[PDB]
Design a protein around this nucleic acid. Structure first.
Ligand SMILES: [Mg+2]
Ligand SMILES: [Mg+2]
Ligand SMILES: [Mg+2]
Ligand SMILES: [Mg+2]
Ligand SMILES: [Mg+2]
Lengths: 147, 103, 157, 187
RNA sequence: AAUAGGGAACGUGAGCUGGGUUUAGACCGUCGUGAGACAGGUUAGUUUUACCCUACUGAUGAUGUGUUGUUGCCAUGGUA
RNA sequence: GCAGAAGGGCAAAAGCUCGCUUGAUCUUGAUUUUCAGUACGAAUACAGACCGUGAAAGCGGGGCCUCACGAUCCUUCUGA
RNA sequence: AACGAGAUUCCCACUGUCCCUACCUACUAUCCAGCGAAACCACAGCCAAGGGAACGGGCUUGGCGGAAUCAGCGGGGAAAG
RNA sequence: UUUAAAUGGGUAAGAAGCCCGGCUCGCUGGCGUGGAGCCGGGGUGGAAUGCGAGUGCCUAGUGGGCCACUUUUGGUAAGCAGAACUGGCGCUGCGGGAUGAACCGAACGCCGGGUUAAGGCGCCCGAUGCCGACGCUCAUCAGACCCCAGAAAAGGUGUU
RNA sequence: GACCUGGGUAUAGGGGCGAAAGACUAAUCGAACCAUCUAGUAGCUGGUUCCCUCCGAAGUUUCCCUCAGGAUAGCUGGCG
RNA sequence: GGCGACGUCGGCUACCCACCCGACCCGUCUUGAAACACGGACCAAGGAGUCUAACACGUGCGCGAGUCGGGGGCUCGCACGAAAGCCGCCGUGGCGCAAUGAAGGUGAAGGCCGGCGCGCUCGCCGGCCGAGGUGGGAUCCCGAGGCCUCUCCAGUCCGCCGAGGGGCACCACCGGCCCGUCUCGCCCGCCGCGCCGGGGAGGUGGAGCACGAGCGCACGUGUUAGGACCCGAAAGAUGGU
């Protein structure tokens, strides 16, 4: 939409919105990230602190597959199974606790986030946190490990 | 040259990138071209199944993907041993063979 | 250009005034500062440790921290186009009690004891203060004598 | 000449929506009639929120609405929001509350109606309660956006907590000088 | 008689001259490791255009007297 | 007189002499100064340690106060 | 010594270099028949003083201000290149 | 430098306040001490004038300034160089100062009537074409209106 | 006479040739000419195209091989 | 209420002229230009903020703890069709939903009640709920009281209402929680008893949690990389004549 922009309204004005005195030319202060320690330093601190220097160990050839674990915390733990079975087990027959394996839902580690409902579960995961292992044992649940 | 709070960006355009540009204007015309190459091949092997041989069951390697099952390249030459069909007769009946595969 | 150093323009203000030198009197140390007290800053010259800065000498702030030898004071300071609440740690010899609220803490006392003094008596005392009114239509007396005639004197060197 | 002002003197609120939605224009013609004719301030707050941007009209989850209506007294009033109602997965049961919104989502309006609730629009809100009597009008968290945590003083300022714009979170991306006491200074 | 002192874009180069200064060649002295430097000295070194407008200088003429001619007057300007 | 430039300050003293000592050590934040209210440097008020000195109250984390100093990357040494 | 289209000083001889200019001749310039450009050009084109970017043509206050032109001319246009 | 102005700078002029009773504490410690915090309770009229305020995001241009009172530094001085406070010019016409960047009045949508500001009213040129009031002054170089555009020491039996 | 000259022939660009003047190398020489890299770069000059309405600056702070330039705070407008 | 014919009535613009008054030539850099500063003899046509990628914020739209087919595939061979429609065990993947530490790695829920271990600065069990508290806070709720042609009998209505109540968003503060470190300390567990694992209490560092707001698409503005608003060097290099 060339119609709607600032250059059709700035037409007739002498210096096209850039000034008589500064008179915008080509590249007044360098190209790109030039001068980040010299004359653009006050920009690079207060908006980019930490931009300059080594900070850690080098790890050649990392693979983003060995370090792979998605995490569910316990608020989204009952949305991994159907709504038919969070209410099926609760209506007081026996201690029949449903399974919830997170690993066919796309998750490896189970984390903690409170308000788990008072139903017993068994939960299959590869990893746990020490909060998540005891929010589940707080409602009479079991924390079964898989590999 | 910069200004107030924004990203600090590294655009990779410091090279003669306008001679190496790829425009996908033929990409409709290559989709109907490779459809016709599927249709004219499907009736050339007319009774045989389209998309060729049977492929094996293969579990993906990594920590990220070893929960899932994938089509493979071919059968390991010991399946054809145990299932009892010859390896030079397997590919002419419609069975993909991969001799470098270990079970 | 102009020597941005601490204790710069203080030839006369971090100086003990005249014939009041020597070791400092002891009721200065026996002053009790609590939180929210309104204190005024005046850096002396004998004690060297906790002088604030020349920016605050003469100013008046409020106590938020009380330490063994000092007091944390929030003062307003004028930087260029805005003021800022700066919290300055000043030792106890450079401050004193400001009397600037103590003419208000007297007339919250003698106002509330006078508010109920008319509530029990039914009047309209109007305890809100007015500034100096124009003078009453009075009636001067010139008893017996006459108003003395004065005239501008001549010029002499 | 008269004074030495800086000419603020043009109030910079909104008098009509910038949206060209013709259904939303009919709500404005419904409620800017009610605002000037019913002597209620409910119909002035609802009318000025129909003007507001999509940013200034945040969504409201279904778990804040039942958290802000289990307060004492709120048991048989109506939930009013000029904005959308998404559901929480986090909540387990839903009460039988009566709501009113522009645009309840699909999963949220399935869960209110199973529990016995009732969704309204602003049309049938106006025929039930024209004054806005017996209503609890709510709002979503308008500083809930990710945009607002880049807003503040400046990341290099001391005591800032202001989340700089980095193209990738990780080691070597804005962590060396001005961020730790070893490499130079910490802010 | 007297050989007073000044000004006018330090009057005056489409008026001249080009001696001096102030390019490029060369020599000498001092200086610098050197290239080179020196209102220190010496020598050799292209000086373009008016036909425009005004100003000035002369040359016809124009307005007015009906036309035309002869003889005149002096406003004003110059002035030895 | 207070090591030296000045100004301020100081008398059973901040000066002179003597007796002990190592707080010129370890550690985290805050505040002040310049200031964009960024950094360095300098400083102030603490706190948790381990110490000195004094009969004790206490005082002391360099010099009576105002100056005496220095990023990234690299290097070196120390620490579990 | 000889030789310099080298630099300089004097002397004789000679002469319009000068006193101090004058006259003659050719080729023009000039007028006519024919043929005929270019540089240049904000608008233009009479001055004195004042103010002003401190040296105006225009502006202010005065002086004043008749067509159309020709041969020259080098003050000005802070003339052109 | 004993003393020490004018001008100026901070602060206070209430409910976020005042009072009462109670509970916590690992701080403090002769003490049911000290101080902080916390809960419950009691009574609002607390200088004058003026004004509707609060807050967030995005953000261009600018980063050569100059001037005038007043106060100041260097300089013999400067339409000089450098500062302080306020106004202005730059960005701004208009009336006046003949002329004009900044002086003096006054700031401006398009017009009619009225009235003024600064300045003026012999004639250019609107308005003294008033029977204006009192004096001073004679120049053979008279004088004549902020900035401001020309004068001093010294002298006169010139006149008052 | 270290003479003048024709045609033939040789030497080529950081190269040639020079009784030396940085002379000459096709009107080009203190580094030729043609085409390409190339629309090279410029904090520096010049220019930057319709109307009306509303608001309206700054020439100062701090840092920079900074001083004809930027970054930063102030000043502005727009959106709420 | 009056007046006027075949040439008179009324009218205005890019018509011409005359007079009074006001009036210097524009663009441009600049403290200041009418300038003895530069560009401009005249006229026509051409002629300078573009696109692409990335990012930020604003706004509109769709869906929403999700979201998007952009890459493929399917449909009969159709002009328009280089479109449109469809897939869904084609959602692989991107961005968001979790942070933090150099890394090993670890990884966000509390309050009320009753009981007892020396209720011993330390604590343990169980229930009940379940994102804390304080101060302001639009809106809403309750509301004593009050308001009309004759006085006692009652119900909708309506408006005024001191006060009280529940408090959205947001702001300030206090408390808690997770990760890194630091000081201080004791207890607990056993795919096997160790130069093991886990816990505590205080202070601190983080772009965190404290009942989610993102994604895709479009547009506008700003900045950046690209010839980058247009025009301009002295150069450098490559290969030739
Ligand atoms: Mg403009
Ligand atoms: Mg602009
Ligand atoms: Mg500019
Ligand atoms: Mg005045
Ligand atoms: Mg001009």
């Amino acid at each position: 939409p060339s119609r709607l922009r600032k250059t059709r309204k700035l037409r007739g004005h002498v210096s096209h919105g850039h000034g008589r005195i500064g008179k915008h030319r080509k590249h007044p202060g360098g190209r790109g990230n030039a001068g980040g320690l010299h004359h653009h330093r006050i920009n690079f601190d207060k908006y980019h602190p930490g931009y300059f220097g080594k900070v850690g160990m080098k790890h050649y050839h990392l693979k983003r597959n060995q370090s792979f674990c998605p995490t569910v915390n316990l608020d989204k733990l009952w949305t991994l199974v159907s709504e038919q079975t969070r209410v099926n087990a609760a209506k007081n027959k026996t201690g029949a606790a449903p399974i919830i394996d997170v690993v066919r839902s796309g998750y490896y580690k189970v984390l903690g986030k409170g308000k788990l409902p008072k139903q017993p579960v068994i939960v299959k995961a590869k990893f746990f946190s020490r909060r998540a292992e005891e929010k589940i044992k707080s409602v009479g649940g079991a924390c079964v490990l898989v590999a | 040259a910069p200004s107030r709070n924004g990203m600090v960006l590294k655009p990779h355009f410091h090279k003669d990138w306008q001679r190496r540009v790829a425009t996908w204007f033929n990409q409709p015309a290559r989709k109907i071209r490779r459809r016709k190459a599927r249709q004219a091949k499907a009736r050339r092997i007319a009774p045989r199944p389209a998309s060729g041989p049977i492929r094996p069951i293969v579990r993906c390697p990594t920590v990220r993907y070893h929960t899932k099952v994938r089509a493979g390249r071919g059968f390991s030459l010991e399946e054809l041993r145990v299932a009892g069909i010859h390896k030079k007769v397997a590919r002419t009946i419609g069975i993909s063979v991969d001799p470098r595969r270990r079970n | 250009t102009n020597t941005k150093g601490k204790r710069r323009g203080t030839r006369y203000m971090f100086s003990r005034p005249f014939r009041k030198h020597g070791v400092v009197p002891l009721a200065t140390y026996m002053r009790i500062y609590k939180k929210g007290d309104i204190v005024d800053i005046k850096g002396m010259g004998t004690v060297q440790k906790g002088m604030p800065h020349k920016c605050y000498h003469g100013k008046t702030g409020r106590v938020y921290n009380v330490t063994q030898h000092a007091v944390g004071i929030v003062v307003n300071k004028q930087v260029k186009g805005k003021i800022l609440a700066k919290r300055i740690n000043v030792r106890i010899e450079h401050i004193k009690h400001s009397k600037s609220r103590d003419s208000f803490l007297k007339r919250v006392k003698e106002n509330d004891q006078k508010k109920k003094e008319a509530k029990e008596k039914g009047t309209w005392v109007q305890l809100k203060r007015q500034p100096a009114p124009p003078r009453e239509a009075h009636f001067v007396r010139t008893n017996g004598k006459e108003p003395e005639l004065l005239e501008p004197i001549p010029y002499e060197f | 000449g008269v004074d030495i002002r800086h000419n603020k003197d043009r109030k910079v609120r909104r008098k009509e929506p910038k949206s060209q939605d013709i259904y939303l224009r009919l709500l404005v013609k419904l409620y800017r009639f009610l605002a000037r004719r019913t002597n209620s301030t409910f119909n002035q707050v609802v009318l000025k929120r129909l003007f507001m941007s999509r940013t200034n009209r945040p969504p409201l989850s279904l778990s804040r609405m039942i958290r802000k209506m289990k307060l004492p007294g709120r048991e048989n009033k109506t939930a009013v929001v000029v904005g959308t109602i998404t559901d929480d997965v986090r909540v387990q049961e839903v009460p039988k509350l009566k709501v009113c919104a522009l645009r309840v989502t699909s999963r949220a309006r399935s869960r209110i109606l199973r529990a016995g609730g009732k969704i309204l629009t602003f049309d049938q809100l106006a025929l039930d309660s024209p004054k806005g009597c017996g209503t609890v009008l709510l709002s979503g968290p308008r500083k809930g956006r990710e945009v607002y945590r880049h807003f503040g003083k400046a990341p290099g300022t001391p005591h800032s907590h202001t989340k700089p714009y980095v193209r990738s979170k990780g080691r070597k991306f804005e962590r060396a000088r001005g961020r730790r006491a070893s490499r130079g200074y910490k802010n």
